[PDB]
Write a protein that binds this ligand. Structure first.
Ligand code: FES
Length: 106
């Protein structure tokens, strides 16, 4: 799947994430996950605070109730379609997904 990561400084990094892989898995491989995953990707923290283009949020597997509670624990401003990276599974059909990462993810 074509995955685009929009950093805070504006630098964009695009990777290929295979089916069943989490945007978090491909990030650690392209040097993008340097967000110090607290739960280590076990979906138990809010360090993976990112913004998924509202166009893939209602398409990729609806975030689980564990993310909603961790989403209220983020350090930056939440968005109506705000999402995390360790609870989303990429797929070829959803290729073109745009992920927006802020300057405050803690
Ligand atoms: S990396 Fe910990 S909740 Fe996503």
């Amino acid at each position: 799947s074509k995955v685009v990561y929009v950093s805070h400084d504006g630098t964009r990094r695009e990777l290929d994430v295979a089916d069943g892989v989490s945007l978090m898995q491909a990030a650690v491989s392209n040097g993008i996950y340097d967000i110090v995953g607290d739960c280590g990707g076990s979906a138990s923290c809010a360090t993976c605070h990112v913004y998924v283009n509202e166009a893939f949020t209602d398409k990729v597997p609806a975030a689980n109730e564990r993310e909603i509670g961790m989403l209220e624990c983020v350090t930056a401003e939440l968005k109506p379609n705000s999402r995390l990276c360790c609870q989303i599974i990429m797929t070829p059909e959803l290729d073109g997904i745009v992920v927006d990462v802020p300057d405050r993810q803690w």
